[PDB]
Amino acid sequence: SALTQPASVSGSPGQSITISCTGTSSDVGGYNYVSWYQQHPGKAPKLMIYEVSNRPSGVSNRFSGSKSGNTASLTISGLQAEDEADYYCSSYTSSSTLYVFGTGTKVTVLG
Ligand SMILES: [Ca+2]
């Protein structure tokens, strides 16, 4: 199965929002290899977080990653209009799929 994500998360400018990503003990709960990606419409995906909480360069420190048990979370602090995009998680898995992805969350920013 895919990782479970909410279809839609919204916020006002300046709000802190969190996107959940739920798997199992064979993926999100078994390893520290959770990544998060941002995709604006018609653009290439961008790696925002890897290894649960690590940011590549060029990613705002307003983005942070964590996990607890079988659920990973992406938190966006100080929400800005430019954050309106789709967000996906992935995890390494012990299974043959090797990596498993979430179904994606559309973030809408008020205004
Ligand atoms: Ca908007």
Author numbering: 4 to 114
From the paper:
The LCs are composed of an N-terminal variable (VL) and a constant domain (CL). Even though full length LCs and other proteins have recently been found as part of fibrils, patient biopsies predominantly revealed VL domains that result from proteolytic cleavage of the LC as the main constituent of amyloid deposits. The patient variant (referred to as Pat-1) contains 11 mutations in the VL domain compared to the corresponding germline sequence (referred to as WT-1). To determine potential structural differences between the two VL variants Pat-1 and WT-1, the X-ray structure of both proteins were solved to 2.5 Å (Pat-1) and to 1.55 Å (WT-1) resolutions.
The corresponding germline LC sequence, named WT-1, was identified by database-assisted (abYsis, IgBLAST) primary structure alignments searching for the germline LC with the lowest number of residue changes with respect to the Pat-1 sequence. However, incubation of the VL domain of Pat-1 revealed the presence of fibrils after a lag phase, while the WT-1 VL stayed soluble. The melting temperatures (Tm) at which 50% of the protein is unfolded were determined to be 48.9°C and 57.0°C for Pat-1 and WT-1, respectively. In WT-1, this proline is not involved in a hydrophobic interaction network. The hydrophobic interaction pattern of the WT-1 L81 misses one interaction each in FR2 and in FR3 but two more interactions to the C-terminal region appear. Overall, this leads to three hydrophobic interactions of L81 to the C-terminal region (V109, V111 and L112). Q82 however forms hydrophilic interactions to four residues, all located in FR3: R64, E84, D85 and E86. We therefore cloned WT-1 L81V and analyzed its properties. The thermal stability of WT-1 L81V decreased by 5.5°C compared to WT-1 and the cM value for chemical unfolding, is reduced by 0.42 M GdmCl. In the same line, upon incubation the WT-1 L81V mutant showed an increase of ThT fluorescence indicating fibril formation.
